Amino acid sequence: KLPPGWEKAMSRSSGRVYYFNHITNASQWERPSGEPARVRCSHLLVKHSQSRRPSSWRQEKITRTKEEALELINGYIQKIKSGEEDFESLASQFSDCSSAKARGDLGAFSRGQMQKPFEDASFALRTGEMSGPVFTDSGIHIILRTE
Ligand SMILES: O=C(O)c1cccc2c1OCCO2
Ligand SMILES: O=C(O)c1cccc2c1OCCO2
Ligand SMILES: [Cl-]
């Protein structure tokens, strides 16, 4: 029916059908369009107190709860989707990954290199698509597939 991971759902506020991807946590009103050895992704990471390494270039001691990290992620997603901010701008400013200095770019990678939820989301994104919140042991990610 739909590309990998996508399913139909009903909006609770509007009653209109939308589409949700349970691999990427992407959600959208529009019916999703239409696997390579490698993809290229950028990401914005928000770490929390239960991150594998609760430290980043932004903060020596990361203390925010996972719930607070998710709220931050949700707010960045809203600004990206509204066009108020660019993904790259938010990643450079607020990603708890050292890839922040490359606008979140991780370069290209294969299956078998990244943490599984990140890998699965990356490979289920189409080129140009953005994930919803993706959870790993590092924290919570927004992933943008660029190639
Ligand atoms: O170590 C770094 O400064 C760095 C710079 C750009 C991209 C990265 C980086 O480290 C984590 C992987 O992705
Ligand atoms: O793997 C790393 O530590 C690293 C360091 C600098 C730049 C990078 C890196 O990983 C891939 C992205 O580009
Ligand atoms: Cl915070």
Side-chain angles (χ1 to χ4, degrees), residues 46-47 58-59 62-65 68-69 72 76 96:
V46 178
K47 284 188 169 180
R58 319 197 48 227
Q59 206 167 29
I62 297 197
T63 54
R64 68 171 72 90
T65 71
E68 289 166 335
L72 288 161
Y76 298 141
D96 281 314

Side-chain angles (χ1 to χ4, degrees), residues 14-32 34-106:
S14 84
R16 242 193 307 149
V17 180
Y18 71 103
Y19 299 87
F20 167 70
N21 189 304
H22 61 253
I23 313 172
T24 67
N25 287 323
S27 54
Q28 56 185 55
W29 295 116
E30 304 82 8
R31 214 201 173 260
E35 96 175 9
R38 312 177 92 210
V39 296
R40 183 191 187 167
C41 293
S42 300
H43 80 138
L44 190 164
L45 170 67
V46 178
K47 284 188 169 180
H48 50 72
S49 66
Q50 288 189 60
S51 284
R52 173 217 263 111
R53 298 177 19 231
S55 192
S56 82
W57 69 269
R58 319 197 48 227
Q59 206 167 29
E60 183 159 21
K61 182 167 207 43
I62 297 197
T63 54
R64 68 171 72 90
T65 71
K66 187 163 14 129
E67 179 172 55
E68 289 166 335
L70 180 55
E71 196 23 72
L72 288 161
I73 288 275
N74 284 335
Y76 298 141
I77 292 176
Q78 298 181 291
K79 282 182 181 313
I80 295 165
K81 287 199 160 184
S82 67
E84 181 181 344
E85 292 270 38
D86 281 357
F87 173 90
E88 294 92 339
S89 176
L90 296 182
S92 301
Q93 301 180 67
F94 306 121
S95 181
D96 281 314
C97 183
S98 56
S99 59
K101 70 176 59 67
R103 299 184 317 150
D105 175 45
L106 298 173

